[PDB]
């Protein structure tokens with residue numbers, strides 16, 4: 001039903017953090033990314049099934065799967081501009097602040113949807129987002145859960161207390177990364193000293209390109225008390241409001 005005939009794929013080039021992925025052509029027309037296993041065959045297939053059951057404008061769009069033979073493939077839309085972190089660096093001289101805001105908005109819409117479906121991302125960060133030829137940012141729904149020190153809240157670092165609210169903290173850091181055009185958070189510190197200082201209440205300082213209004217949004221994501229952080233729904237509203 002989601003099954004694709006592998007005969008209609010043409011492999012064009014190998015493309016890290018997104019696994020074993022190649023650029024291809026589907027039915028001579030459609031640019032695709034084609035994923036193969038690097039995980040057991042069983043869990044790769046169950047990942048594909050998670051993807052079959054999730055759908056949003058800001059999740060990388062599943063086109064189909066090949067599971068009736070080996071090797072197993074997962075097929076999605078090709079995101080031509082690659083990973084967000086490298087894209088921020090590539091285009092750093094060009095961005096206008098409205099664009100930075102739309103990128104935050106894109107990822108925030110994906111996360112509101114995933115929150116609503118009781119999935120946690122668990123590595124929400126610029127390196128793990130993809131960008132299409134239109135500049136639209138999307139998130140992967142492969143490998144979701146139902147600890148990157150610089151993107152984790154204290155309750156995760158200390159207690160492995162993962163929740164919507166821990167993805168909220170990471171989304172704040174991702175906002176900081178976007179507004180800093182891909183700089184490393186807490187550059188001054190080792191991972192260990194980062195974990196240390198954050199529990200002591202260290203927060204990321206306002207990037208050059210973030211207005212006070214925008215900073216207020218990312219900063220709300222980092223409340224010590226998880227229950228004082230906003231939901232992705234509230235975040236999107238705040239982001240939309242600051243947009244006009």
Ligand SMILES: Cc1nc(Nc2ncc(C(=O)Nc3c(C)cccc3Cl)s2)cc(N2CCN(CCO)CC2)n1
Pocket residue numbers: 015016018021033034035060074075076077078079080081082083130139140141142
């Ligand atoms: C690593 C990488 N991927 C790119 N595009 C992708 N589109 C969709 C991808 C993907 O992984 N789908 C997927 C699958 C298949 C299964 C489960 C889950 C998912 Cl999300 S990977 C582009 C790219 N480029 C290198 C540098 N460039 C400079 C141009 O500005 C050209 C672009 N590099």
